[PDB]
Amino acid sequence: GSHMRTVKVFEEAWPLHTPSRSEARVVVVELEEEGIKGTGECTPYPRYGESDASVMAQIMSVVPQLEKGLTREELQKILPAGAARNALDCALWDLAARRQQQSLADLIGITLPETVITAQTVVIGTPDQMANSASTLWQAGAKLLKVKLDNHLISERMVAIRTAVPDATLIVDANESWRAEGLAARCQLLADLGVAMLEQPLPAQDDAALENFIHPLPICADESCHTRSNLKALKGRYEMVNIKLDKTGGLTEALALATEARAQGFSLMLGCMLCTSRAISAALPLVPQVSFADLDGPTWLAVDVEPALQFTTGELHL
């Protein structure tokens, strides 16, 4: 009635710098409230049963309701949390801000700093290789390093890295590759090296062992954390939750998750999937609430949208 809109849904596979496999697949949704366009992007999460086809179908399914004026509050009850709702929720926020000639940040009413520290990835390799990489990235300006680890050479790798960048803030993404057996001693080693945080060491569907020992360092939930709904399960297993719009299904849930998570004593982290600047921009409003920001997804793409956000080693310039 009072708000009629047009919806455009299209799929985009952006090439990556180096071998998603060779491309970041995203789904874009453009809304039009007469003259004003609202754009929302999302990245179907394979690990949660989504594909571009799967997510596009969910969006179409609600196109009719989007044209009669579906608000953000109404959208939360129609679609479940996931990439589809994320594109729509973000598209609606973009539209609601442009229709007031304001930046997403001002609409919400939060202040964005001029520079944001983003985690630089130190990929798996021999202790020596990981140490050299950490040193070079530290020299280039990265204050926060995200060390990727599997189940091998955990001690030497972390030792060689810390010795190389004694002043660097380090966080470890074990990415569900670690096991219950010996998990405590390992966390203890990360603590001996001043590791600020350990991320999702165990599989989301088998992380009970995290309640069997006093955590020597904060341990963050990633795959185990989607929406406020998991907060109960997480209590007693994790100190921090990694918030991602594709998992919360939009900025609206992300915001409520931040508030709700804090209230329960959880520390926050802001993550992202492989995406274009459009997705990072949509997440920025959360930056002032998180301990760590891992938003360099766009830098993994050969090219980005135009205009794009400015990224330098370890930094996001706003």
C-alpha positions as a printed Julia matrix, in Angstrom:
318×3 Matrix{Float64}:
  0.0     0.0    0.0
  1.96    2.98   1.36
  5.24    1.36   0.26
  5.28   -0.44  -3.12
  8.59   -1.96  -4.29
 10.32   -3.74  -7.19
 12.7    -6.66  -6.57
 15.7    -7.78  -8.59
 17.6   -10.92  -7.64
 20.82  -11.93  -9.34
 23.73  -14.27  -8.78
 27.42  -13.29  -8.95
 30.54  -15.49  -8.92
 33.57  -13.3   -8.15
 37.06  -14.66  -9.02
 39.6   -15.13  -6.22
 43.3   -14.13  -6.22
 44.39  -17.7   -5.53
 42.42  -21.03  -5.31
 35.06  -21.4   -2.13
 37.3   -23.18  -4.64
 38.16  -20.61  -7.27
 35.33  -18.1   -6.79
 33.22  -16.42  -4.09
 29.59  -17.0   -4.97
 27.19  -14.29  -3.81
 23.53  -13.5   -4.32
 22.46   -9.88  -4.69
 19.06   -8.37  -4.01
 18.16   -4.9   -5.22
 15.02   -3.24  -3.82
 13.37   -0.13  -5.27
 11.08    2.14  -3.23
 10.62    4.56  -6.12
 13.9     6.17  -7.13
 15.63    4.94  -4.03
 17.44    1.61  -4.38
 18.27   -0.75  -1.53
 20.99   -3.33  -2.13
 21.72   -6.36  -0.01
 24.32   -9.04  -0.61
 24.79  -12.51   0.88
 26.98  -15.59   0.56
 25.2   -18.97   0.62
 26.91  -21.07   3.33
 27.61  -24.57   1.95
 28.28  -26.0    5.42
 24.66  -25.18   6.38
 22.87  -26.58   3.34
 22.68  -23.53   1.1
 23.65  -23.04  -2.53
 22.98  -20.07  -4.81
 19.93  -21.9   -6.21
 18.71  -22.76  -2.71
 18.98  -19.17  -1.45
 17.54  -17.59  -4.6
 14.52  -19.85  -4.24
 13.97  -18.66  -0.65
 14.16  -15.02  -1.72
 11.74  -15.42  -4.63
  9.36  -17.22  -2.29
  8.98  -13.9   -0.51
  9.19  -11.47  -3.44
  5.37  -10.97  -3.54
  5.34   -9.96   0.13
  8.4    -7.73  -0.47
  6.44   -5.69  -3.04
  3.49   -4.91  -0.73
  6.0    -3.35   1.69
  7.46   -6.12   3.88
  9.3    -4.39   6.71
 12.4    -5.73   8.44
 10.4    -6.59  11.54
  7.99   -8.68   9.45
 10.82  -10.4    7.56
 12.21  -12.01  10.73
  9.09  -14.16  11.06
  8.84  -15.17   7.38
 12.27  -16.63   6.55
 14.65  -18.55   8.84
 18.14  -17.25   9.67
 20.44  -17.86   6.7
 21.95  -16.26   3.59
 18.55  -15.57   2.0
 17.21  -13.57   4.91
 20.58  -11.83   5.15
 20.36  -10.41   1.63
 16.79   -9.19   2.18
 17.34   -7.81   5.67
 20.42   -5.94   4.48
 18.66   -4.74   1.33
 15.86   -3.33   3.53
 18.36   -1.57   5.84
 20.12   -0.03   2.84
 16.76    1.17   1.53
 15.68    2.51   4.92
 18.88    4.56   5.17
 18.92    5.95   1.64
 15.27    6.96   2.05
 16.52    9.26   4.8
 19.69   10.32   3.04
 21.89    8.93   5.83
 24.66    6.36   6.12
 23.73    2.99   7.64
 25.82    4.01  10.64
 23.86    7.22  11.25
 20.49    5.53  10.77
 21.41    3.15  13.59
 23.06    6.01  15.42
 26.48    4.5   16.11
 29.9     5.99  15.39
 32.37    4.25  13.14
 36.06    4.8   13.83
 38.31    6.0   11.02
 40.38    2.83  11.04
 39.42   -0.73  11.98
 41.95   -3.44  12.89
 41.21   -6.56  10.86
 42.66  -10.02  11.32
 45.35  -10.98   8.83
 45.47  -14.66   8.02
 48.68  -16.59   8.58
 47.99  -19.75   6.62
 49.13  -23.25   7.6
 52.71  -24.19   6.71
 55.91  -25.31   8.41
 56.83  -23.46  11.63
 59.47  -21.51   9.71
 57.09  -20.53   6.89
 54.37  -19.47   9.32
 56.88  -17.43  11.3
 58.24  -15.58   8.25
 54.72  -14.84   7.07
 53.7   -13.52  10.49
 56.79  -11.32  10.59
 56.19   -9.87   7.1
 52.52   -9.19   7.81
 53.49   -7.58  11.13
 55.99   -5.36   9.3
 53.32   -4.4    6.74
 51.05   -3.11   9.51
 48.96   -6.04  10.77
 48.62   -5.82  14.55
 46.12   -8.68  14.79
 47.14  -12.0   13.23
 44.74  -14.92  12.82
 46.82  -18.09  12.84
 45.16  -20.96  11.0
 45.99  -24.36  12.49
 45.07  -27.96  11.84
 45.89  -30.93  14.0
 49.61  -30.88  13.26
 52.73  -29.36  14.81
 50.67  -27.15  17.13
 53.53  -26.44  19.52
 56.41  -25.62  17.2
 54.21  -23.57  14.85
 52.83  -21.36  17.63
 56.24  -21.09  19.27
 58.05  -20.05  16.07
 55.27  -17.53  15.28
 55.17  -15.86  18.72
 58.98  -15.69  18.79
 58.81  -13.86  15.44
 56.09  -11.37  16.35
 56.4   -11.06  20.15
 54.25   -7.92  20.06
 51.57   -9.09  17.65
 48.11   -9.85  19.03
 47.44  -13.48  18.05
 44.17  -15.4   17.67
 43.97  -19.04  16.53
 41.38  -20.56  14.21
 41.63  -24.33  14.69
 38.59  -24.52  12.41
 37.02  -27.69  13.93
 40.17  -29.79  13.37
 41.19  -30.34  17.01
 40.04  -33.11  19.35
 38.94  -33.58  22.96
 42.03  -35.59  23.86
 44.74  -33.08  24.79
 42.61  -30.03  24.12
 43.38  -28.61  27.58
 47.16  -28.91  27.37
 46.97  -27.21  23.96
 44.9   -24.32  25.21
 47.45  -24.11  28.01
 50.28  -23.73  25.49
 48.38  -21.01  23.63
 48.06  -19.25  26.98
 51.79  -19.61  27.7
 52.35  -17.76  24.39
 49.87  -15.01  25.15
 47.33  -16.11  22.53
 44.36  -13.78  23.0
 41.75  -16.24  21.74
 41.18  -19.75  20.35
 38.38  -20.19  17.78
 36.15  -23.28  17.38
 38.72  -26.02  18.07
 36.09  -28.78  18.05
 33.32  -29.76  15.57
 30.04  -27.9   16.15
 28.27  -31.22  16.61
 30.74  -32.59  19.16
 32.13  -29.81  21.36
 31.04  -31.07  24.79
 34.64  -31.59  25.95
 34.8   -27.78  26.24
 32.98  -28.04  29.59
 35.5   -30.46  31.09
 38.26  -27.95  31.87
 38.84  -24.38  33.0
 39.69  -22.48  29.81
 43.18  -20.92  29.99
 42.23  -18.42  27.25
 38.95  -17.24  25.78
 37.53  -19.83  23.39
 35.27  -18.56  20.57
 32.26  -20.17  18.92
 32.05  -19.93  15.13
 30.2   -22.78  13.45
 28.49  -23.4   16.81
 27.01  -19.9   16.87
 24.23  -18.78  14.49
 21.58  -16.82  16.36
 20.45  -16.0   19.91
 18.84  -19.44  19.87
 22.22  -21.17  20.4
 23.24  -18.94  23.33
 21.92  -21.44  25.87
 23.91  -24.33  24.43
 27.02  -22.17  24.17
 26.92  -21.06  27.83
 29.67  -23.02  29.58
 31.49  -24.04  26.41
 32.58  -20.69  24.97
 33.62  -17.26  26.24
 33.15  -15.55  22.86
 30.82  -15.84  19.85
 31.77  -15.05  16.25
 28.89  -13.07  14.69
 28.39  -13.35  10.91
 25.42  -11.86   9.07
 25.05  -14.92   6.82
 24.57  -17.06   9.94
 22.37  -14.62  11.91
 20.38  -13.99   8.75
 20.82  -10.23   8.6
 21.93   -7.19  10.56
 18.73   -7.14  12.6
 19.45  -10.5   14.25
 23.17   -9.74  14.45
 22.41   -6.6   16.49
 20.0    -8.42  18.79
 22.58  -11.18  19.13
 25.3    -8.72  20.13
 23.07   -7.17  22.8
 21.76  -10.51  23.97
 25.17  -12.2   23.98
 26.83   -9.44  25.98
 24.04   -9.56  28.55
 24.87  -13.23  29.14
 28.56  -12.55  29.64
 29.85  -13.42  26.19
 32.54  -11.37  24.45
 31.94  -10.6   20.77
 33.79  -10.96  17.51
 32.62   -9.84  14.06
 33.33  -12.17  11.15
 32.46  -12.45   7.48
 32.41  -14.92   4.6
 34.06  -14.39   1.2
 32.18  -11.35  -0.14
 32.33   -7.92  -1.79
 32.54   -4.63   0.1
 28.74   -4.58   0.1
 28.62   -7.27   2.78
 31.29   -5.69   4.97
 29.56   -2.28   4.86
 26.36   -3.98   6.03
 28.22   -5.4    9.05
 30.12   -2.28  10.14
 27.44   -1.06  12.58
 28.61   -3.87  14.89
 32.3    -2.88  14.92
 32.17   -0.66  18.02
 30.79   -3.64  19.98
 33.4    -6.28  19.18
 36.8    -7.29  20.57
 38.07   -8.47  17.19
 37.02   -7.63  13.65
 37.65  -10.15  10.88
 36.24   -8.29   7.87
 38.85   -8.63   5.12
 36.73  -11.01   3.04
 36.82   -8.64   0.04
 40.64   -8.72  -0.14
 40.41  -12.4   -1.08
 38.73  -11.48  -4.36
 40.76  -10.61  -7.48
 38.51   -7.58  -7.95
 35.81   -5.96  -5.84
 32.76   -3.8   -6.45
 33.24   -0.21  -7.53
 33.61    1.74  -5.3
 35.15   -0.58  -2.75
 36.25   -0.25   0.87
 39.91    0.57   1.36
 42.0    -2.2    2.89
 45.73   -2.11   3.7
 47.58   -4.96   5.43
 45.66   -5.53   8.66
 43.48   -2.45   8.33
 40.11   -1.33   7.03
 40.0     2.41   6.33
 36.59    4.03   6.68
